[PDB]
Design an enzyme around this catalytic site. Structure first.
Site, PDB file in Angstrom:
ATOM      1  N   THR A 186     -46.796  -9.556  82.248  1.00 17.92           N
ATOM      2  CA  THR A 186     -45.454 -10.113  82.293  1.00 17.92           C
ATOM      3  C   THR A 186     -45.110 -10.536  83.717  1.00 17.92           C
ATOM      4  O   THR A 186     -45.591  -9.957  84.695  1.00 17.92           O
ATOM      5  CB  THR A 186     -44.428  -9.104  81.781  1.00 17.92           C
ATOM      6  N   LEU A 187     -44.254 -11.558  83.823  1.00 16.73           N
ATOM      7  CA  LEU A 187     -43.989 -12.233  85.086  1.00 16.73           C
ATOM      8  C   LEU A 187     -42.495 -12.344  85.371  1.00 16.73           C
ATOM      9  O   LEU A 187     -42.075 -13.245  86.107  1.00 16.73           O
ATOM     10  CB  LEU A 187     -44.618 -13.632  85.082  1.00 16.73           C
TER      11      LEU A 187
ATOM     12  N   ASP B 212     -40.891  -2.737  77.718  1.00 14.78           N
ATOM     13  CA  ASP B 212     -41.050  -2.069  76.431  1.00 14.78           C
ATOM     14  C   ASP B 212     -40.671  -3.008  75.293  1.00 14.78           C
ATOM     15  O   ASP B 212     -41.391  -3.125  74.294  1.00 14.78           O
ATOM     16  CB  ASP B 212     -40.186  -0.805  76.377  1.00 14.78           C
TER      17      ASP B 212
ATOM     18  N   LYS C   3     -40.770 -15.788  85.135  1.00 11.78           N
ATOM     19  CA  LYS C   3     -41.797 -16.783  84.866  1.00 11.78           C
ATOM     20  C   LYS C   3     -42.497 -16.571  83.529  1.00 11.78           C
ATOM     21  O   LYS C   3     -43.396 -17.344  83.191  1.00 11.78           O
ATOM     22  CB  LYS C   3     -42.829 -16.790  86.001  1.00 11.78           C
ATOM     23  N   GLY C   4     -42.090 -15.579  82.752  1.00 15.13           N
ATOM     24  CA  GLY C   4     -42.593 -15.415  81.398  1.00 15.13           C
ATOM     25  C   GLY C   4     -43.728 -14.403  81.339  1.00 15.13           C
ATOM     26  O   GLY C   4     -43.612 -13.295  81.870  1.00 15.13           O
TER      27      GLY C   4
HETATM   28  N1  LIG Z   1     -42.286   7.702  85.493  1.00 17.09           N
HETATM   29  C1  LIG Z   1     -41.913   7.496  84.110  1.00 17.09           C
HETATM   30  N2  LIG Z   1     -42.629   8.039  83.127  1.00 17.09           N
HETATM   31  C2  LIG Z   1     -42.277   7.848  81.840  1.00 17.09           C
HETATM   32  N3  LIG Z   1     -41.215   7.115  81.488  1.00 17.09           N
HETATM   33  C3  LIG Z   1     -40.440   6.530  82.446  1.00 17.09           C
HETATM   34  C4  LIG Z   1     -40.761   6.698  83.786  1.00 17.09           C
HETATM   35  C5  LIG Z   1     -39.774   5.968  84.527  1.00 17.09           C
HETATM   36  I1  LIG Z   1     -39.650   5.769  86.638  1.00 17.09           I
HETATM   37  C6  LIG Z   1     -38.886   5.380  83.602  1.00 17.09           C
HETATM   38  N4  LIG Z   1     -39.283   5.743  82.373  1.00 17.09           N
HETATM   39  C7  LIG Z   1     -38.662   5.286  81.131  1.00 17.09           C
HETATM   40  O1  LIG Z   1     -39.009   3.929  80.996  1.00 17.09           O
HETATM   41  C8  LIG Z   1     -38.002   3.248  80.230  1.00 17.09           C
HETATM   42  C9  LIG Z   1     -37.967   1.796  80.635  1.00 17.09           C
HETATM   43  O2  LIG Z   1     -39.239   1.178  80.457  1.00 17.09           O
HETATM   44  C10 LIG Z   1     -36.704   4.033  80.422  1.00 17.09           C
HETATM   45  O3  LIG Z   1     -36.121   4.291  79.143  1.00 17.09           O
HETATM   46  C11 LIG Z   1     -37.131   5.362  81.084  1.00 17.09           C
HETATM   47  O4  LIG Z   1     -36.703   6.509  80.381  1.00 17.09           O
END
Ligand SMILES: Nc1ncnc2c1c(I)cn2[C@@H]1O[C@H](CO)[C@@H](O)[C@H]1O
Ligand SMILES: Nc1ncnc2c1c(I)cn2[C@@H]1O[C@H](CO)[C@@H](O)[C@H]1O
Ligand SMILES: Nc1ncnc2c1c(I)cn2[C@@H]1O[C@H](CO)[C@@H](O)[C@H]1O
Ligand SMILES: Nc1ncnc2c1c(I)cn2[C@@H]1O[C@H](CO)[C@@H](O)[C@H]1O
Ligand code: NA
Ligand code: NA
Lengths: 313, 314
Positions: free
Chosen positions: B215-216, B249, B219-220
């Site tokens: 992911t960018l 996510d 920039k997509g």
């Molecule tokens: N080091 C980590 N290990 C596992 N999960 C993590 C982190 C961290 I920095 C943030 N988060 C979780 O990631 C979510 C966003 O992608 C958010 O929902 C957050 O809870």
């Protein structure tokens, strides 16, 4: 007899087992997370009450404040004049402290913003004229209005803007200083206050009865307008852990000592003790008062006579 | 059926109305928003897959406070049977402050997440059949390794998705998570960091995986095959961005739901781009809403009527 105005909060304190000096997307894996009672007014009122003073907390909290209220009342704090917001939640301080005691934090005011609706006239009508009101970090408008009410009603006040100095403008800061019986800052805050107000050291000292400037590991300075200066070194730490609330603790110990009739140096030594006890605890009100340990560390730092004089009161 | 492994958390998200670039140690930010939301990468991805109609099982460690979260996820079709509930620890907590420019300063307390290392994917297989795909998301580091090893030995296709934990993991730990992956998901910064920490070259990595997804941000996204075949998909342009938490996510979930539905790489990436912008335009990672018509409209605006029709059909 001391009315403490300022923030009432819940502190979410975390420990980063590394160094912030290294390092936009900052992410810190922390190994401790605890929730504690906080806010500068909460902390100072708690410390004054634990030390046996007569103290009233004057600030704004949310409806979640019942347990905090019981916790403070159990140690002698008058919470009658805490404004409870019907809608907002108690302020939230979130802080991560690193290995070197450096800190990165966020503060959500919430209910604190309603402190501007508090009238110190009601507190006076209800429990007499306070011998001192601490104008601590708070809703900025509440800070200004509280200082103005003190000026108008003839109440001695302590300017204690600390955390909010960065968010207040130069004129707002200038409006909080004139007529103060005390000015409390740390040395960084002292320099920032001067730079933002445009005032000189002399300009400030001409308007206050005493300047109290904490110096972290180098202790504290108490400076009179005529230049008379008392320097008090720290009660050296042996188990420092989190610096949150250390300044509140010093102010509380110092003002409790003054209220008990101790001189400036003795009161500052007591403040130094309370400050190190907070430094050696995670939460701002997680410290415990041990009379014997207090006497011992005071004596080690300042002498048996000083320790005996302090613990006597 | 997709088995999503990774963190389960509570996110405390705050908005700083300034710039961290100016304050750049005793940093203090007066924030004007504070909200608590469901989070964790596995939570977010499972939620998005369920909302999109996929068959998804959440495999991670939470605390005893997980009941309402469990109901919230089950209501969206997520199988939470195999969430390990710690008898002693509390659900992990992510704390984050986002500034005007979408920059972020955050702390993460693992808590119960540390117990994910006690989870056996063999039990999940025994209970609900071999998963179509196992997402090795950011988690307890030992759990990440053990999950990847169990996938390798049981013959399960997996997606390496270390994202947030890449900074914690050592070079060898990272190298142990990559080989045999059907997908590698990172953002571009994470891609460069992965290369620098493992000592591998682009070619070294591509020789070990079936597809690289990078992911960018604005920039997509790039989807790169080992033979160099590259698909670039531009973003579904934002109109009300607010908080970038969970955007990756969300993209992974949309993309993998599209793949599970039989869409090609480009179409799946277009769907992922849509879900990602919807999360970008919400505060919490699971605060977004699925509107079929708005989805069709923004997909069509970005990628064409036929692409949007193909995507929304599935
Ligand atoms: N080091 C980590 N290990 C596992 N999960 C993590 C982190 C961290 I920095 C943030 N988060 C979780 O990631 C979510 C966003 O992608 C958010 O929902 C957050 O809870
Ligand atoms: N900007 C602010 N305004 C009012 N109070 C503040 C802040 C900040 I930054 C921190 N705090 C409170 O100060 C206490 C430590 O002195 C802690 O207990 C914390 O709650
Ligand atoms: N009593 C003490 N002994 C030694 N060091 C002290 C103190 C105290 I009170 C503070 N400090 C140092 O000053 C910062 C917090 O005020 C932190 O940098 C902290 O290390
Ligand atoms: N759909 C979009 N339209 C425009 N910009 C986007 C997106 C998406 I998904 C991400 N970004 C960029 O990435 C940052 C958060 O990852 C954002 O702060 C932003 O710079
Ligand atoms: Na402390
Ligand atoms: Na978001």
């Amino acid at each position: 007899t001391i009315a403490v105005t300022g923030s009432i909060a819940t502190d979410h304190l975390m420990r980063f087992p590394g160094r912030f000096s290294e390092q936009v997307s900052l992410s810190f894996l922390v190994d401790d997370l605890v929730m504690h009672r906080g806010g500068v007014a909460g902390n100072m009122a708690f410390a004054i009450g634990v030390l046996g003073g007569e103290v009233a907390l004057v600030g704004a909290a949310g409806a979640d404040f019942a347990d905090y209220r019981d916790w403070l009342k159990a140690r002698g704090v008058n919470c009658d004049h805490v404004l409870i917001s019907e809608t907002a939640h108690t302020a939230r301080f979130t802080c991560t402290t690193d290995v070197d005691m450096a800190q990165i934090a966020s503060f959500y005011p919430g209910a604190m913003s309603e402190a501007r609706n508090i009238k110190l006239a009601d507190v006076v009508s209800a429990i007499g004229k306070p011998e001192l009101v601490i104008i601590g970090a708070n809703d900025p408008e509440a800070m200004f209005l509280h200082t103005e009410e003190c000026r108008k009603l003839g109440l001695a006040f302590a300017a204690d803007p600390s955390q909010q100095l960065a968010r207040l403008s130069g004129e707002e800061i200038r409006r909080l200083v004139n007529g103060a019986a005390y000015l409390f800052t740390n040395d960084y805050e002292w320099d920032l206050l001067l730079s933002k107000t445009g005032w000189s050291e002399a300009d400030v000292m001409a308007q206050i009865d005493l300047r109290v400037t904490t110096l972290g590991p180098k202790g504290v300075d108490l400076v009179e307008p005529d230049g008379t200066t008392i320097h008090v070194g720290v009660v050296p730490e042996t188990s420092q852990t989190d610096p949150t609330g250390v300044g509140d603790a010093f102010r509380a110990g110092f003002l409790t000592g003054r209220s008990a009739g101790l001189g400036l140096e003795r009161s500052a030594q007591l403040g130094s003790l309370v400050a190190v006890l907070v430094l050696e605890s995670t939460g701002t009100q997680e410290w415990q008062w041990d009379y014997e340990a207090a006497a011992s560390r005071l004596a080690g730092a300042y002498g048996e006579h000083a320790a005996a004089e302090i613990v006597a009161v």
